[PDB]
């Protein structure tokens, strides 16, 4: 109630070499109305990308019903789609991470896990590996919360701290003679970019039995991921990169992430608000905030970002009709390499 500051630990190896590190902290629930115009304000604003604090157009989908005072089910309900402006959300632009490495700029953004009335913000910070030599403690302000960035130098030459051991993610012929496999944590963000090489759902159609025709008119872009808190960015999907296809499988087989609430009912919404017909299927629920409320509409080459507090967007692709893809995804993938 009075406790408002949280620590965000970011681990650093002793030796530093396109590598970016990531830290995150899940903040306590805050009222949904107070998340409007909420933007991260960091002390170290002298070296952060200026585009994250800019406005990204979202289609907001909420549900609201009427029920008896002691009832969990609803006598009636409806959904409302509105165009809202959200700043500071984890909308990464094309080559923003690469430009930030050569520019020594941080990426500070947040994810939103909301029900109909409250939101759990998850604050992320992506810094180049060059931020692990100075290891200067930074301060980020997000709404009513204060976050202290704490850099800890793990005991490993370049690798990842995994269960008290140091694992270096890798290969090829050398791997056959000897190798080891480690389960490594990964965070992914969808980068919306039009392009003949970024037609993502052409590979969704090939990897999965998903009956998905007319991939030309579906969202274009890729996911960018940082593994072990220290690696070069992995572009997802990449057909000849088995690590990339492992992340690709986890994103679309476990779209809500790898980690009570009672379903009130399915609903459809117009995305964007100006759409002539319903374009997105969702499931209205009651329950404490759980999974991310941020997603991107599937059936639009230009990314239509959706914010659906209290609704679970259609993430299945057995029918690409009125579906969505997650904005963020966290999970574990198995990587070859060695311990040091």
């Amino acid at each position, epitope marked *: *109630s*009075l*406790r*408002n*500051v*949280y*620590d965000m630990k970011i681990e650093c190896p002793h030796t530093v070499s396109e590598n970016s590190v990531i830290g995150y902290v899940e903040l306590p629930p*805050m*009222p949904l*109305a*107070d998340t409007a115009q909420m933007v991260p*304000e960091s*002390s170290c604003s002298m070296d952060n990308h200026q585009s994250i604090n800019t406005i990204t157009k979202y289609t907001q989908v909420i549900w609201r019903g009427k029920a008896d005072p002691g009832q969990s089910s609803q006598n009636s309900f409806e959904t409302v789609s509105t165009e809202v402006d959200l700043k500071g959300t984890c909308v990464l632009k094309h080559k923003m991470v690469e430009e930030s490495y050569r520019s020594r700029k941080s990426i500070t953004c947040y994810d939103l896990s909301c029900n109909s009335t409250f939101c759990k913000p998850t604050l992320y910070m992506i810094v180049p590996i060059h931020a692990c030599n100075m290891m200067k*403690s*930074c*301060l980020i*302000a997000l*709404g*009513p919360y*204060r976050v*202290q*960035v*704490v850099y800890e130098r793990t005991y490993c030459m370049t690798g990842v701290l995994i269960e008290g051991k140091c694992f270096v993610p890798d290969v090829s012929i050398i791997k056959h003679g000897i190798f080891d496999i480690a389960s490594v944590h990964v965070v992914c963000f969808f980068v919306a970019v039009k392009g003949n090489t970024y037609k993502l759902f052409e590979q969704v159609k090939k990897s999965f039995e998903s009956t998905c025709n007319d991939t030309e008119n579906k969202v274009q872009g890729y996911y960018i991921c940082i593994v072990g808190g220290n690696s070069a960015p992995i572009y997802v999907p990449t057909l000849d990169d088995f690590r990339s296809m492992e992340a690709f499988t986890g994103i679309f087989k476990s779209p809500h992430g790898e980690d009570s609430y009672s379903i009130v009912g399915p609903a459809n919404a117009k995305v964007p608000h100006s759409a002539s017909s319903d374009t997105l299927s969702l499931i209205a629920y009651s329950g404490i905030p759980s999974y991310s409320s941020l997603s991107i509409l599937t059936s639009s080459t230009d990314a239509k970002h959706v914010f659906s507090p209290g609704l679970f967007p259609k993430l299945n692709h057995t029918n690409c009709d009125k579906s969505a893809i997650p904005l963020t995804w966290t999970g574990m993938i198995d990587l070859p390499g060695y311990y040091e």
Partner: antibody
Amino acid sequence: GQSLEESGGRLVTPGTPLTLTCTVSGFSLSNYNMQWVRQAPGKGLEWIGIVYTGGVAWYARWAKGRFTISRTSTTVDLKITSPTTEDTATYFCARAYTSNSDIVFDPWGPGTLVTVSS
Amino acid sequence: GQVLTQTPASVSAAVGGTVTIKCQASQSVSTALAWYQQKPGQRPKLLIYLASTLTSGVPSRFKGSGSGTEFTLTISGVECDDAATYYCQQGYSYSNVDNSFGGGTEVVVKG
């Protein structure tokens, strides 16, 4: 029995760097966030900045570049880089009312008086 | 950046009567508002943290209320000891803030 006591208030000519110190009794300084607040005679309370347990200082928009807040094991500092006659006030030191918090501040020190004139 | 506005600048209340002073925020501060009492030549004294929670030793004659953008402080059965200047302070956000305290309100007790 927690208390604070500022030190260093004195008469200085304009432009002369001045540092104010806030000694702490009755509690561990490592567990609380601290703030400096000044009050010109007859005027209202003016927030200056907050120093968090991680050592980073967060200042008010007008105070940016004119003040510096720093933290040690047992003291909290406030340096006026180049005082002007408008800086004459009583400067207060305040502990955050609870740990891991910066919402509200208690207890307060008696304050120390800074006078800037030729 | 939130700006706290207090009205009126000065109020006069009779001994044993009731006085109400208001604090207004430019942007929402939810429940993170506080009320300080300060007498001349004395350090600020915290009376209410959060919207309506009294600190230890503060009489029940002091109560606070409000949420989001409008807050009030009321003193019932005001004594001569209650004559002071009262400041509201928000702890919701310190980003782009010129002053976490409002302009203050002095209450004169009519004896």
